[PDB]
Design a protein around this ligand. Structure first.
Ligand SMILES: CCCCCCCCCCCCCCCCCC(=O)OC[C@H](COP(=O)([O-])OCC(O)COP(=O)([O-])OC[C@@H](COC(=O)CCCCCCCCCCCCCCCCC)OC(=O)CCCCCCCCCCCCCCCCC)OC(=O)CCCCCCCCCCCCCCCCC
Ligand SMILES: COC1=C(OC)C(=O)C(C/C=C(/C)CC/C=C(/C)CC/C=C(/C)CC/C=C(\C)CC/C=C(\C)CC/C=C(\C)CC/C=C(/C)CC/C=C(/C)CC/C=C(/C)CCC=C(C)C)=C(C)C1=O
Ligand SMILES: COC1=C(OC)C(=O)C(C/C=C(/C)CC/C=C(/C)CC/C=C(/C)CC/C=C(\C)CC/C=C(\C)CC/C=C(\C)CC/C=C(/C)CC/C=C(/C)CC/C=C(/C)CCC=C(C)C)=C(C)C1=O
Ligand SMILES: CCCCCCCCCCCCCCCCC[C@@H](O)O[C@H](CO[C@H](O)CCCCCCCCCCCCCCC)COP(=O)(O)OCC[N+](C)(C)C
Ligand SMILES: CCCCCCCCCCCCCCCCC[C@@H](O)O[C@H](CO[C@H](O)CCCCCCCCCCCCCCC)COP(=O)(O)OCC[N+](C)(C)C
Ligand SMILES: CCCCCCCC/C=C\CCCCCCCC(=O)OC[C@H](COP(=O)(O)OCCN)OC(=O)CCCCCCC/C=C\CCCCCCCC
Ligand SMILES: CCCCCCCC/C=C\CCCCCCCC(=O)OC[C@H](COP(=O)(O)OCCN)OC(=O)CCCCCCC/C=C\CCCCCCCC
Ligand SMILES: CCCCCCCC/C=C\CCCCCCCC(=O)OC[C@H](COP(=O)(O)OCCN)OC(=O)CCCCCCC/C=C\CCCCCCCC
Ligand SMILES: CCCCCCCC/C=C\CCCCCCCC(=O)O[C@H](COC(=O)CCCCCCC/C=C/CCCCCCCC)COP(=O)(O)OCCN
Ligand SMILES: COC1=C(OC)C(=O)C(CC=C(C)C)=C(C)C1=O
Ligand SMILES: COC1=C(OC)C(=O)C(CC=C(C)C)=C(C)C1=O
Ligand code: SF4
Ligand code: SF4
Ligand code: SF4
Lengths: 318, 215, 115, 70, 96, 176, 156, 171
């Protein structure tokens, strides 16, 4: 019965990723005065299936100079980690109920960077290497401030349990209490998912295909699926953390509908942002995250430690 | 390479991502045009100037025609010269759309390219209506122009021109005041006026350094 | 047990996708096809040569700033103590010390990348 | 169209609906229809273990009320 | 005015001869606009115009399902247009 | 006459300084760019439904070449070789001899379409409107040899496209 | 036979997937690449057919030779053709790539890219219009609809 | 033998398993392989030779090798560890039969095993390559162009004159 739950989680997520590819193409097309996919299937509804079937029937290449073991391990790690980061999300009930869900997401996301690191190194080509060192720099840029923002926001939750976030925001969204932290968190999640304007690792104009330039076919497809699953997962985490849906214990379907709508809106905002802006230089991302975000985050952390004590508004569950 | 702007083998020397030396290797599109011109008549050599700078065709035709007219000691009729200047300015608009939108695309802004290439398409329609070819018309000739305008072309040119400023405004709203665009462009590739003059620069590459020159 | 089963399932699915990707299609490998990509020309040196790090000093600072995150994570539980005056003094002491270290490195040009 | 983007969004929404609803229904089906117990601490786990022992069918969910105390 | 748009969609469905013709024109041409019939070829191609559309979409052709020897229910191309309708369709003249 | 593009100076009063601080901290210009993209999202796209819809052309358009006839069916070409002389790509090859009835006609008229630059010089040079560039542009092939036209292919193209070629010529010959 | 029916259906499915998802290399040489960009422009929107440019050769399915191929360039073009995983297709666009064109008699120009790589479709013109390149792409799609790989394997 | 050959390539494929199974350890098999370009040139010359109408030719290489030495040289040029172990004829035949059931191109067959462990005949009464103007190319000058693909990254740049040609049982 638990395996049925695992499958009912992981298969719909892959289908959502497949159709998010089409939705992104159509949103970008219509923001660019064109249409996007509308031929293969009514309204391009069969385009993701054609893409997947073309990729998995295409020859996979193992580079002559590459390390083969790491070259094959990296996409497996990427996809499995992207699938695993979904299990503690309460929708309104989680698949795996943890005391410290937030720390689990933190650790698994910080493990996910080694997929890019090891694929870029194991390709044994120059553009892949440049992509990998850009990944190193990006993680160094965003990690500390991301963690401090999470701590500051959760100081009103009372714990690290994700389900407590539903009862914390029973009356008001957490975005009305910490909107500067919400802004910094949104930019941090854009940087954490290698999304425009922070899509430095791929670096398409600058680095051809970057870290995954050597990759082709099915192995290449796995990287794409992992990235888009990460997009959806991070936006769902943001929706749970800042726009809290109201949960009726006798009707969880209403909560599920509302939460799915909110995360879809955040994902569409990601696509909008990609369509609207140019790319950062990767030293400029580090300067932004270390000279503007970090001091404000430290000050707001001090403020959010002090405020519940001053106002006698400390949450329960020591 | 997507950012190589065609066929360029730019051999680069780097310490980390810093650039120590740039060594542009060219000739990947050297087709031996000048010898071929030496094997043709003056009318036969004219279409080569279309394919020299394939973003500004009629301007190249105009330069070659002016040179041949100077060597012939003849003068084009006034209507031909007005048509030439009109289509030269249309060509300048085409070239500047290409330059700005592809620069933005390299830097990472993809949308203005799509917005402005529709205007490029309409101007290609003007090219084809006057000559039958969208980009290598060969309309401007040493004695003037090949054919007169069709009876309803000026109206459509006016209709395009009365609306193009809003498209420019939308592009400007996307780029000019964006802090990411300014971070990627301000203080990048600074060149002094004297160095620009000595290195043989021309056009915007002189005007951006304050030199008040325009042919 | 449930988390172990989830990890096993996800890793198995990814491995099966790799296996299908490598055994289903027709393979035609020859030396030119598998050579390294450098935009159509052969690379000069090796990709295993040393690659300079211009932000090396910030990377070391990341190691120290990361450990102060571990010191600040227990703060939600620390807010439940009876002596809230000692805890609040110590939480601010740690955060002020962390801001002072950023201010020191910033003013000594430690955040600027090497050229 | 712009309303032709909607079918893909609807398909994605239907796909994303499945995990939460499936988890809720599977939790209800394997816990007597009453919202699977949460045990974040040892006291709740002890309560669950005690319930399992007195049920007589080795299941924590079956509940013995006032009819089990004669 | 949303109801006006929805009713316009329902009359688009009805104007293609019902659901069967609507789906045929949606899967063959990926377009369900209804225009005014200008004429028909001897090969079976039909030609439509709708002057309310912008320049480029105001004329179109629904290709025949059978030309000289091949089944063209799915496989169509611009070279199946005869020269006279070729001149009309590419807007080189105003007269069909 | 000249103008400056980047020679302005910002105001230093409290009102404008706070305005710029709010721009820095609340991302107003980025919101404006997002708004422009949102505005474009709700416009009608410029895409046409090819091949059911076609792009607009004109009577002067230069397409695939053809050889024409007089209304009686006699060929127009008289083997003057002006088109061969003027062709900037040397794509035309011609041979000729007196026909069995004494007419001046060709025995070879070849156009290498992979040499042709589609400049239209040949149809300007022709004194009898025998060689033209017709309106067809959809004639891609699967082999290289199918694009080396001989006289039979060009005459077949003329017979195939005359109904449109004559109308196109009627619409432009007064500009020529 | 049952096996013939099964292989015919599988061949149909694979061919449909291949032709509906055609990713060309981001690769252009000369004048013809401007018309390629105009084919990617909103009016024609090649992306609506499933055609998407990708920069890396390992992630590309079609190579469009758009412009003159010179002798200095030919080894690079061959090299990025070799690094395309199979199946792969080549489209020759423009007179220069078809047979040399205006520069056919030059000392530094390859007289047609088909001396260096095998070509599936030839698109005529100098340059071909974006509509003509779209016609050639759809012709390549129709050609991919016609291949019989699994049927021929079964007949072996 | 050549770049697309089923000879040198076939031996290279065996390394994945671990050891190289050889009947009688390959000490009773003699091979005389010939380069592909030599064969193609010989065919072209036989077309243009008016004297070769009803003739019968034998195209063989300049050297004869024991199978053990040939496989050892192949593994040395590819810089792979060579692990030869003797397998009885029946056992090898059984293995060959199992591979044959592949609906695709089989990795090996019973017939392939038979032909691999069969000595090359000597037919000195037939004309050869040298009677068509061809000087046969030795394996030691063309092995690298076939086996450099089978090396790891560590040995990819090793040159041709590094791998110490094998011993030939000639005369
Ligand atoms: C006793 C226990 C022994 C443990 C063995 C470890 C498992 C590896 C065994 C097979 C790998 C070797 C195969 C090979 O080299 O090419 C084969 C073959 C040879 O290719 P070739 O072109 O002929 O020549 C290549 C050259 O020889 C040169 O080839 P190369 O340069 O690629 O060789 C490098 C390779 C060769 O290996 C060796 O040199 C010796 C092997 C010993 C490695 C053990 C070191 C200890 C590392 C930590 C502990 C790991 C777990 C061990 C415990 C096992 C019990 C659970 O070494 C490795 O890459 C080690 C990677 C394995 C570690 C996997 C851990 C996953 C990390 C995920 C994140 C962790 C999250 C937190 C937890 O090519 C292939 O068939 C394709 C590649 C095969 C890859 C399959 C998947 C990767 C390996 C399985 C990982 C299992 C994880 C569970
Ligand atoms: C601005 O130009 C660009 C675009 O715009 C035109 C892009 O789209 C774009 C992104 C690339 C696109 C072409 C998207 C490509 C689509 C994917 C690579 C295909 C992935 C789809 C599958 C692998 C998903 C999984 C397959 C199943 C059908 C899902 C269910 C899984 C089972 C186990 C069940 C890039 C990089 C770009 O540069
Ligand atoms: C014409 O080229 C050739 C090929 O083409 C590529 C071949 O594959 C080939 C041999 C056929 C196989 C495909 C060889 C490659 C397969 C290996 C990787 C076998 C791996 C199987 C093992 C079980 C690996 C796991 C190890 C166990 C202990 C478990 C030969 C002989 C060949 O000659
Ligand atoms: C989404 C994830 C879950 C999906 C669930 C399904 C997972 C499927 C498992 C993954 C593999 C899928 C690949 C399917 C194609 C078959 C590949 C391989 O297994 O077949 C051949 C395996 O056969 C071997 O070559 C030898 C034949 C069998 C070996 C004998 C071993 C002893 C078994 C006993 C057989 C006796 C009868 C069996 C019935 C009892 C390999 O041939 P090869 O050409 O290299 O590889 C390329 C395949 N091509 C041709 C299609 C391109
Ligand atoms: C279980 C997971 C692994 C397998 C995944 C399989 C995914 C499901 C398959 C998706 C089926 C949809 C494909 C068919 C849609 C084509 C629509 C129609 O148009 O196709 C026509 C005919 O289609 C083809 O002739 C046949 C396509 C399908 C072939 C048989 C279906 C086989 C399904 C079996 C699935 C089992 C997978 C294998 C499991 C191991 C040809 O028209 P087309 O050229 O496009 O369009 C012309 C363009 N116009 C219209 C604008 C003018
Ligand atoms: C289906 C037929 C089954 C055959 C099994 C073969 C398995 C194998 O190792 O072969 C290597 C095979 C085929 O290569 P070729 O020989 O070049 O081509 C074959 C086509 N003739 O290559 C592969 O695809 C390797 C597949 C990956 C192995 C799967 C297991 C890997 C385990 C990874 C564990 C680490 C996971 C990391 C993330 C988890 C951390 C929380
Ligand atoms: C990779 C590292 C995996 C980390 C897994 C962490 C899972 C987790 O945090 O859940 C904790 C969960 C519940 O704890 P609480 O939430 O505090 O409350 C429970 C009592 N009511 O604890 C558990 O379920 C423990 C179950 C086993 C522990 C995890 C073991 C996994 C170890 C992975 C090793 C990798 C395999 C070996 C090779 C690795 C690379 C090839
Ligand atoms: C991640 C989401 C998608 C997951 C992937 C699922 C894809 C399932 C789609 C199945 C489509 C059928 C595969 C067809 C392609 C097979 C490979 C191929 O085309 O090669 C053709 C090849 C050429 O052979 P020859 O002519 O003899 O040699 C010529 C070379 N000298 O012919 C074959 O080998 C045909 C063999 C049939 C392959 C088996 C297909 C059966 C379906 C398996 C699905 C796997 C799911 C598990
Ligand atoms: C009564 C007690 C209350 C205590 C005080 C509380 C009020 C505090 C008010 C101030 C809060 C401001 C928070 C803003 C944090 C960042 C501000 C900032 O300055 O960052 C910018 C940079 O920020 C950015 O530009 C973002 C870059 C990435 C942009 C990507 C797209 C933009 C996002 C679209 C909308 C996002 C919506 C966020 C929330 C989503 C919902 C969660 C600085 O960069 P520069 O202008 O170059 O100057 C620095 C050196 N002088
Ligand atoms: C106008 O300048 C040019 C480019 O920059 C926009 C190109 O990218 C390219 C080629 C690369 C793309 C894929 C068209 C060419 C040929 C070119 O001329
Ligand atoms: C937005 O996607 C596109 C690209 O990726 C960045 C391109 O490179 C190109 C080719 C033009 C550049 C300058 C190479 C086009 C046309 C395009 O649409
Ligand atoms: S159009 Fe120009 S290049 Fe082509 S055949 Fe005529 S004259 Fe020659
Ligand atoms: S086609 Fe015209 S110009 Fe050419 S040879 Fe014939 S008559 Fe003369
Ligand atoms: S065929 Fe014509 S348009 Fe194309 S690259 Fe050559 S000269 Fe330029």
């Amino acid at each position: 019965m638990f395996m049925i739950n695992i499958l009912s989680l992981i298969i719909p997520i892959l289908l959502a990723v497949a159709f998010l590819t089409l939705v992104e193409r159509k949103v970008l097309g219509y923001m660019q005065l064109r249409k996007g996919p509308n031929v293969v299937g009514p309204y391009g509804l069969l385009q993701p299936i054609a893409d997947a079937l073309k990729l998995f029937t295409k020859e996979p290449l193992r580079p002559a100079t590459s390390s083969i073991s790491m070259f094959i391990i990296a996409p497996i790690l990427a996809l499995s980690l992207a699938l695993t980061m979904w299990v503690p999300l309460p929708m309104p009930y989680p698949l795996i109920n943890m005391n410290l869900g937030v720390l689990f997401m933190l650790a698994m996301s910080s493990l996910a960077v080694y997929s890019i690191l090891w694929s870029g190194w194991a390709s044994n080509s120059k553009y892949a290497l440049i992509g990998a060192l850009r990944a190193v720099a990006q993680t160094i840029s965003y990690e500390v401030t991301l963690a401090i923002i999470l701590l500051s926001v959760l100081l009103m939750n009372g714990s690290y349990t994700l389900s407590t976030l539903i009862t914390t925001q029973e009356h008001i969204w957490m975005i009305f209490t910490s909107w500067p932290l919400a802004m910094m968190w949104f930019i941090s999640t854009l940087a954490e998912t290698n999304r425009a304007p922070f899509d430095l690792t791929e670096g398409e104009s600058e680095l051809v295909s970057g870290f995954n330039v050597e990759y082709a076919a099915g192995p290449f497809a796995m990287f794409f699926m992992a990235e888009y699953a990460n997009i959806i997962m991070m936006n769902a985490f943001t929706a749970i953390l800042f726009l809290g849906a109201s949960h009726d214990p006798h009707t969880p379907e209403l909560y599920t509908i509302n939460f799915v709508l909110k995360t879809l809106a955040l994902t569409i905002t990601f696509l909008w942002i990609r369509a609207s802006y140019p790319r950062f230089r990767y030293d400029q991302l580090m300067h932004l995250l270390w000279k503007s975000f970090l001091p404000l985050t430290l000050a707001l952390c001090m403020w959010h430690i002090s405020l519940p004590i001053m106002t006698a508004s400390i949450p329960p569950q020591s | 390479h997507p950012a190589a702007h065609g066929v360029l083998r730019l051999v680069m020397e780097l310490s980390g991502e810093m650039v120590r030396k740039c060594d542009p290797h060219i000739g990947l599109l050297h087709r031996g045009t000048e010898k071929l011109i030496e094997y043709k008549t003056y009318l036969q050599a004219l279409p080569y100037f279309d394919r020299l700078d394939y973003v500004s065709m009629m301007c190249n035709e105009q330069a070659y025609s002016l040179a041949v007219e100077k060597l012939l000691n003849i003068q084009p009729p006034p209507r031909a010269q007005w048509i030439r200047v009109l289509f030269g300015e249309i060509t300048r608009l085409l070239n500047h759309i290409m330059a700005v939108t592809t620069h933005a695309l390299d830097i990472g802004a993809m949308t203005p390219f799509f917005w402005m290439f529709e205007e490029r398409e309409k101007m290609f329609e003007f090219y084809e209506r006057v000559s039958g070819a969208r980009m290598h018309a060969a309309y401007i000739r040493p004695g003037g122009v090949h054919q007169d305008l069709p009876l309803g072309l000026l109206d459509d040119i006016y209709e395009f021109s009365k609306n193009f400023s809003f498209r420019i405004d939308e592009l400007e709203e996307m780029l000019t005041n964006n802090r990411i665009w300014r971070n990627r462009t301000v203080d990048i590739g600074v060149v002094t006026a004297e160095d620009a003059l000595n290195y043989g620069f021309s056009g915007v590459m002189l005007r951006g350094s304050g030199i008040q020159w325009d042919l | 047990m449930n988390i172990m089963l989830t990890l096993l399932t996800n890793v198995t699915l990814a491995s099966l996708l790799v296996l299908i990707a490598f055994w289903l299609p027709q393979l035609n490998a020859y030396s030119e096809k598998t050579s390294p990509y450098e935009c159509g020309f052969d690379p000069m040196g090796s990709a295993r040569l040393p690659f300079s790090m211009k932000f090396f000093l910030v990377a070391i600072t990341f190691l120290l700033f990361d450990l102060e995150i571990a010191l600040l994570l227990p703060l939600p539980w620390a807010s439940q103590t009876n002596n809230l005056k000692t805890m609040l003094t110590m939480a601010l002491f740690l955060l002020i010390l962390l801001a002072a270290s950023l201010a020191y490195e910033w003013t000594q040009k430690g955040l600027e990348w090497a050229e | 169209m712009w309303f032709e983007i909607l079918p893909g969004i609807a398909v994605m929404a239907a796909c994303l609906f499945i995990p939460g609803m499936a988890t809720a229904h599977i939790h209800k089906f394997t816990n007597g229809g009453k919202e699977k117990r949460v045990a974040h601490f040892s006291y709740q786990w002890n309560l669950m273990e005690r319930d399992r022992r007195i049920s007589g069918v080795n299941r924590y969910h079956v509940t013995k009320g006032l009819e089990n105390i004669d | 005015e949303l109801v006006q748009v929805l009713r316009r969609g329902l009359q688009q469905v009805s104007g293609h001869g019902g659901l069967r013709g609507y789906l045929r024109v949606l899967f063959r041409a990926n377009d369900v606009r209804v225009g005014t019939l200008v004429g028909e070829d001897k090969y079976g191609n039909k030609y439509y115009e709708d002057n309310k559309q912008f320049f480029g979409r105001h004329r179109w052709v629904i290709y025949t399902t059978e030309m000289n020897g091949r089944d063209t229910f799915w496989d169509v191309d611009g070279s199946m247009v005869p020269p006279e309708w070729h001149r009309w369709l590419h807007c080189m003249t105003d007269d069909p | 006459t000249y103008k400056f593009v980047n020679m302005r100076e910002p105001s230093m009063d409290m009102k404008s300084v706070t305005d710029r601080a709010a721009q820095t901290l609340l991302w107003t210009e980025l919101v404006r760019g997002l708004g422009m993209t949102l505005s474009y999202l709700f416009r009608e796209p410029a895409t046409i439904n090819y091949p059911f819809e076609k792009g607009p052309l004109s009577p002067r358009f230069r397409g695939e070449h053809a050889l024409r006839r007089y209304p009686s069916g006699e060929e127009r070409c008289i083997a003057c070789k002006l088109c061969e002389a003027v062709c900037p790509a040397q794509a035309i090859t011609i041979e000729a001899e007196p026909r069995a009835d004494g007419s001046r006609r060709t025995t070879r008229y070849d156009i290498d379409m992979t040499k042709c630059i589609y400049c239209g010089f040949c149809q300007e040079a022709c004194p009898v409107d025998a060689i033209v560039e017709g309106p067809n542009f959809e004639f891609s092939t699967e082999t290289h040899e199918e694009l080396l036209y001989n006289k039979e292919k060009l005459l077949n193209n003329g017979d195939k496209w005359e109904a449109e070629i004559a109308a196109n010529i009627q619409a432009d010959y007064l500009y020529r | 036979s049952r096996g013939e029916y099964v292989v015919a259906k599988l061949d149909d499915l694979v061919n449909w997937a291949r032709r509906s998802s055609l990713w060309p290399m981001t690769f252009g040489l000369a004048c013809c690449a401007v018309e390629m960009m105009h084919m990617a422009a909103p009016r024609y929107d090649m992306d609506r057919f499933g055609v998407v440019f990708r920069a890396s050769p390992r992630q590309s399915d079609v190579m469009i030779v758009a412009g003159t191929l010179t002798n200095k360039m030919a080894p690079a073009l061959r090299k990025v053709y070799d690094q395309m995983p199979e199946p792969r297709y080549v489209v020759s666009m423009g007179s220069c790539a078809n047979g040399g064109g205006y520069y056919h008699y030059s000392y530094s120009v390859v007289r047609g890219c088909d001396r260096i790589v095998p070509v599936d479709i030839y698109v005529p013109g100098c340059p071909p219009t974006a509509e003509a390149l779209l016609y050639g792409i759809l012709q390549l799609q129709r050609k991919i609809k016609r291949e019989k790989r699994l049927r021929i394997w079964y007949r072996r | 033998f050549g770049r697309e050959d089923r000879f040198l390539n076939y031996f290279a494929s065996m390394r994945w398993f671990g050891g190289v199974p050889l009947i009688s350890l390959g000490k009773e098999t003699v091979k005389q392989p010939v380069y592909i370009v030599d064969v193609s040139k010989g065919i072209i010359n036989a077309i243009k030779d008016p004297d070769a109408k009803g003739k019968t030719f034998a195209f063989v290489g300049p050297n004869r090798y024991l199978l053990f030495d040939l496989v050892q040289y192949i593994f040395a040029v590819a810089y792979r560890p060579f692990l030869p172990y003797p397998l009885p004829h029946f056992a090898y035949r059984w293995v060959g039969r199992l591979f044959e059931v592949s609906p695709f191109e089989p990795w090996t067959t019973r017939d392939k095993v038979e032909r691999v462990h069969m000595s090359d005949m000597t037919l000195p009464h037939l004309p050869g390559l040298e009677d068509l103007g061809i000087q046969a190319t030795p394996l030691e000058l063309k092995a690298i162009e076939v086996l450099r693909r089978h090396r790891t990254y560590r040995w990819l740049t090793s040159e041709m004159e590094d791998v110490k040609p094998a011993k030939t049982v000639n005369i």
